[PDB]
Amino acid sequence: ETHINLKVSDGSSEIFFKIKKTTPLRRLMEAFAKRQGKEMDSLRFLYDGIRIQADQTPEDLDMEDNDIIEAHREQIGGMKFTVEREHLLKPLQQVSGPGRPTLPILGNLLLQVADGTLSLTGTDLEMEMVARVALVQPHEPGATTVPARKFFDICRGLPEGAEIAVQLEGERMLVRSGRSRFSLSTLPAADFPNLDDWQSEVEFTLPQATMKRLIEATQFSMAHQDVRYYLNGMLFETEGEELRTVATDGHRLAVCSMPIGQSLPSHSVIVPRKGVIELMRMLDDNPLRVQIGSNNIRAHVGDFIFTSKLVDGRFPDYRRVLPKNPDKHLEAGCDLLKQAFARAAILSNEKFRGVRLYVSENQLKITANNPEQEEAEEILDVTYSGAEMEIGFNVSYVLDVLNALKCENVRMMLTDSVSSVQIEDAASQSAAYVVMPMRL
Amino acid sequence: VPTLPLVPXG
Ligand SMILES: [Ca+2]
Ligand SMILES: [Cl-]
Structure with a gap:
């Protein structure tokens, strides 16, 4: 696993090379050009559309066995494509989700044209999102990076049905559609970070x-x-x-x-x-x-x-967090419980949000008090036949659970006043919620 | 305000 096999192809001629993962690709490029009878300057060597520099190694580019290097006739900043707005909008929105003055390139999208496909990549160094868009119209391979938000906003701002032509001019990317023209600043694709490959387990x-x-x-x-x-x-x-x-x-x-x-x-x-x-x-x-x-x-x-x-x-x-023997089971309609807690919450402490539950035979009483000495009380019919108990909760945590349970009836599994409660859909054990009480 | 039995931290 010290050396790498690589294929170099110009579309008709293919030459294969075995090189050390630490050896610069210069010798490989010059040998391929020589076989074609072409000058080293007259070709550009692209790896997934990104221009290889002669001092870079396979290890630097995270190349893998049987990866392909495409030799193309020289075309400085050659990337070119024309796509329908509608085909770009969702890809651009998706990859622009994941930007510092010291890291301007992280506010850019990497664009790559290769093998009939436009790839767009956004990253924040810890995650990356990549979209592939098939190119139906003629195109030229290459790569660049461009400010993500400005490129998205330009494409979104163009009229319905517009075709968007993109090419490179020096250190800018030219976008044309109708009689609209935009020139955006670029940074080199070779400088865009990429997560190294890993094995799926x-x-x-x-x-x-x-x-x-x-x-x-x-x-x-x-x-x-x-x-x-x-x-x-x-x-x-x-x-x-x-x-x-x-x-x-x-x-x-x-x-x-x-x-x-x-x-x-x-x-x-x-x-x-x-x-x-x-x-x-x-x-x-x-x-x-x-x-x-x-x-x-x-x-x-x-x-x-x-x-x-x-x-x-x-x-x-x-x-280890689930209650060990939550033997006191209360069942109640989810919406009726949620609406009662939501009203009681209005008069709970704005910081600590404590409400008090009193459970008795087929009945739940919810009370809330605040420093102003205002008071809420809600009485609900429930299914409950255990011992009576009083238990306090942060009502926000309770409402969060009831809102996440999208169901008809909920089951609250109780132990005592100082132990966590387990809450689930009365009809499904697929999800479980555990909430620690507040002391009274 | 007790916590769940998280080890560590509770
Ligand atoms: Ca159109
Ligand atoms: Cl049910």
Whole structure:
């Protein structure tokens, strides 16, 4: 695994080379030009459209076995394409999701034209989004980077049905449509960062709606800027035939498990908060293919590919957080409970948000008081036959759970006044929520 | 304001 096999092709002639991963590609380029009877200057060597510099090595470019170097007749800043606005709008919106004065290139999109395809890539150094757009019209291979927001806004601002022609002029990118002309500043494609390749460890396909359910069921329970950096993300776990997400901030936990119809090795990784956000943005036809490595995750959706670094830490075991014997079960309509908590919350303490629950035979009383000595009281019919108890909660955490349960009836599983409560859909164990009480 | 039994941190 010290050397690399490479194919160099000019569209008719193909020459193969074995070189050390640490050897500069200069000798390879000059030898190919020599076989063609052409001058070294008369050709440009493109790797996925990006111009290779003679001092770069395969290792520098993360090349892999049987990668292809395309020799093209010299064309300084040669990238050129013409595409329908409608074919660019969603790709541009998607990749512009993931920008400092010291890192201007991170506010740019990488554009690559190669093999009949326009690729657009956005990155923030820790995640990247790539879109592929088929080029139906004539084009010329090459690459550049261009300010993402300005390019998107220009394309969006052009009229419905416009064709957008793009080419390079010195250090600018010229965009033309109708009698509209725009010249944007560029930075070299060779300077755009790219995550090095990695090995997928577990791989599975699942419907977009299933992944969306898993994230929406738990996303609200993630920590915000917790020093326990692992809590700011979402645990993604494979076990048996299920995929599971877990989120917690130390006061509440959410766990959701869904079947994915294929038994898998057990694997457990932490996806960062911004990665969870980007994953959700992609879940707009076809299903979703997920690859999970030891330090990275990748999601393939249609003609998009999202990759994110993982959070390197030890996520808590939700199994240890679930109440051990929550033997007092209350069931109530979800909407009726939510509306009662929402009204009681109006007169709770604005900072601590405590409300008090009194459970008795088939009845729940919710009360709230604030420093002004205002008081709310709500009485509901519920199903409950356990011992009477009084337990306090942060009403925001309770409302967060009830809003995430999109169901007819909920079950609250109680132990005592100082122990966590487990809340689930009365009809489904797919998701579970655990909320610590406040002391009274 | 007690926490869930997270190890560490509670
Ligand atoms: Ca048109
Ligand atoms: Cl039900």
